[PDB]
Design a protein around this ligand. Sequence first.
Ligand SMILES: OC[C@H]1O[C@@H]2O[C@H]3[C@H](O)[C@@H](O)[C@@H](O[C@H]4[C@H](O)[C@@H](O)[C@@H](O[C@H]5[C@H](O)[C@@H](O)[C@@H](O[C@H]6[C@H](O)[C@@H](O)[C@@H](O[C@H]7[C@H](O)[C@@H](O)[C@@H](O[C@H]1[C@H](O)[C@H]2O)O[C@@H]7CO)O[C@@H]6CO)O[C@@H]5CO)O[C@@H]4CO)O[C@@H]3CO
Ligand SMILES: [Ca+2]
Ligand SMILES: [Ca+2]
Length: 866
Amino acid sequence: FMPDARAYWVTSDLIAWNVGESVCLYASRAAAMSLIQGYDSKVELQPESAGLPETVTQKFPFISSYRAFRVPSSVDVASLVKCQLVVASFDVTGLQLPGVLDDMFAYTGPLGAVFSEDSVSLHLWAPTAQGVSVCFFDGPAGPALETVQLKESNGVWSVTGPREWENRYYLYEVDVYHPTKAQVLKCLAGDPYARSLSANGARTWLVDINNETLKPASWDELADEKPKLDSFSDITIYELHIRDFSAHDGTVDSDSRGGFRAFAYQASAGMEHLRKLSDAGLTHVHLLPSFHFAGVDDIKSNWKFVDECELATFPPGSDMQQAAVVAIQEEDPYNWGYNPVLWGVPKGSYASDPDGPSRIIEYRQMVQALNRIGLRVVMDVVYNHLDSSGPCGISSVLDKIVPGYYVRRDTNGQIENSAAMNNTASEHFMVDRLIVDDLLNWAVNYKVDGFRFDLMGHIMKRTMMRAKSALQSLTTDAHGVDGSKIYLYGEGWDFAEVARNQRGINGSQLNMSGTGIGSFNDRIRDAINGGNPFGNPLQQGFNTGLFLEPNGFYQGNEADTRRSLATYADQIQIGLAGNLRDYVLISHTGEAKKGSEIHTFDGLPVGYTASPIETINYVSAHDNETLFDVISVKTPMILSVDERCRINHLASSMMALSQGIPFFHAGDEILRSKSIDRDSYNSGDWFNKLDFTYETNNWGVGLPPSEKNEDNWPLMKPRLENPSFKPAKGHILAALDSFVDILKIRYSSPLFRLSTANDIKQRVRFHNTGPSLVPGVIVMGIEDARGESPEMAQLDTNFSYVVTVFNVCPHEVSMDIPALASMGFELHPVQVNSSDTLVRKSAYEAATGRFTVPGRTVSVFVEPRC
Ligand SMILES: OC[C@H]1O[C@@H]2O[C@H]3[C@H](O)[C@@H](O)[C@@H](O[C@H]4[C@H](O)[C@@H](O)[C@@H](O[C@H]5[C@H](O)[C@@H](O)[C@@H](O[C@H]6[C@H](O)[C@@H](O)[C@@H](O[C@H]7[C@H](O)[C@@H](O)[C@@H](O[C@H]1[C@H](O)[C@H]2O)O[C@@H]7CO)O[C@@H]6CO)O[C@@H]5CO)O[C@@H]4CO)O[C@@H]3CO
Ligand SMILES: [Ca+2]
Ligand SMILES: [Ca+2]
């Protein structure tokens, strides 16, 4: 006897059901109804003629067609939402309650644990629960000492106790009806507003987050020690995985590797690396999920490893490495961590001790340690889905307390798994509150500097906007953090059930235009690399040999590939200009077009932003092939690793010198490889190695785990086994040196970092365009106040003009730019002192404004004011 849920209880007095041209509601407290009988109460619903109110349809657009039914006043709603409910016609079905729950029980009062000099109080939102109690434990594994009943007041359960409650461990015992089991079950659950947990979150630790003993030395002075940030336009991002950082770092003692503590090792190879990029100009470091997620056991004694020495003896293109890693993947210390369980607590496995304060203290110490070397900290936040749901499981918490509320459901009442599994419903009040609250927890209690939203397109826009004002209004005097400096960005993908605003206006790329919130520019990524993560891996792009260097894979005639190369070049140039929708570019057809007037391969605007700070330019990230791996797959095999080394630099240089916000994947600068693994979320330390000795880049360490790569093994094997694909220390260091220099160039002039669209439209121009453009060359010019009586403000005191030439051709080129004739252009001082002998041969001839640039080279020219 388990009916689905095709009816909706949207308001205290309205029920929406999509029946056709006698409807009754049934309620059983003990959940004993069967096919309609065994009910405790019965009431008939009067068909509404005015239909659903605008508030309902605007909150739940996908049911604006449903028929409306009115619930009598005699009906006690608060009591019914606790019982089992169905509805029948004269077809039977259950009810989805989020609507009415919000209508009647929307709560803004204290949640979780509150502390006073005299007492401690607990608060839990569970409007459907029939009873809530708290079990107290004395330790992480001790027996239950005491059980205390909580009183419900407006769907919120509370209780107050002596201050001796502090430091106790506890769990809620919730008595709720679960739709998936059609039973009233008594489950144990952690606190959604937990601030700390025992190992694996088995219990909640009743700790005071403001306790002085949880603060590193000088913690309250961190606001004063934070790296300065004049504008969001100055931001550069470096995406790093906490374990990847030190797992293989021999300079950090064995025990302290792989977690938060490793960052306290100032003089380690890894930290010296971050310090080097920081001194170069890198502002922000984006850490992969560091909250409480499933997939990694917090108990280190349970961890298992592979024989790193044995696997090192296997052949480069063997399948033995992955078979060994896969064999223990479910029990190793590794995982990206995209499996949310509790959002407001640091991951136990990254702490020195899962039980106690170490996870709190060490996290702060990590934030402080990164701030002290000039780096602000960004958290990878995943509010779009949950690891688990239902009554059973240590990894299920939210859906255990208020079943069917925190998770998004289809029209049949079944849970949506679009995001991965157990999609969240940010469109629900208390879900929205939980998200904004969690953000404030990290910004204030941990002094985090920014947030990257995973699957931002699955989050309501209003949630994103309400969070943005709450975070940016934080002040040093009231909170100890400067909220105005906090930056937000995320994946604005629009797909599945949230597409076309079906669940309301979501945080997609097009909806976030003009919000000041950044989104990943997938347009410039695909144009540079070629194709897309869903297409043929051999599809070539602007920076991977399209037309100029065919790889063998058939992609049309010379005329077609040449045309496509030009098309990609247009998208890249729009992205270089901040990916603005109103920026006017001379397209390859010769016709002038705005960024929004140029369309993607599937018919949507390439440029879609209203500001440069809304675009996150990139060519690589944690997911999909690494930069080095994608280049080694798409370019012709005949190419040497020496030439590919330059191809890598071209890619990251295009990001480092583009308007908007450059985003770098940890390893780009050192040719990092995952041996061509396209989804290394679960591939262990072996395939995710970050070698800071610079001896290797992890290329040719066997084929990648078959689960996600087996269908491309034939393509990888020959390349992995080919010794001429493997870079040596020399190459890696060279890559790192030239990467550093490019950062220095971005921060040597404010012209690379224009703050508004108006400024970009006025100063940024491209000089190699039209139907007769030289293939494989991009010439970007940036103007500043020149001569007397300028229509601009002098933004740069050193240069009055800046020209950048991107040459992806194998051969040297000479670009005649008459507009820039008879000027004082010199090779950038940083490139004149470059260790790359090639770029130093860049020249400029005044009489014709000719710029001579070597092949596979990016050359920056400037015009001194002095
Ligand atoms: O979602 C299922 C998907 O999950 C995983 O994919 C990741 C992926 O690794 C990430 O890179 C990212 O993808 C982003 C893209 O970065 C972004 O460009 C955009 O993609 C758009 C594409 O540009 C466009 O081509 C189109 O994609 C279509 C596509 O034509 C179809 O082939 C089909 O794709 C399916 C795949 O073929 C299939 O393998 C599987 O993919 C998994 C995958 O296993 C995993 O790595 O399912 C998909 C979906 O059915 O359909 C799509 C969409 O109709 O349109 C997209 C979006 O407008 O956005 C994506 C995110 O969707 O994130 C995904 C998911 O986290
Ligand atoms: Ca810095
Ligand atoms: Ca794993």
